[PDB]
Amino acid sequence: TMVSFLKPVLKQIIMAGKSMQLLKNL
Amino acid sequence: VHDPLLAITFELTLRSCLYPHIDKQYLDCCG
To answer: Which cysteines bridge via disulfide bonds (chain B)?
Structure first.
């Protein structure tokens, strides 16, 4: 249900998306 | 963006050149 192709940059994927929403809430 | 990056080892180290582009944007966002 998952691949490991996107793993070497995944932290900076998730931690950018959620933080951008927390920018949008302001 | 990655389609012109192929012009300027394929999909291993070359794909690891695509990832700085989401990294630089991520730094600006979180900072």
So the answer is: none
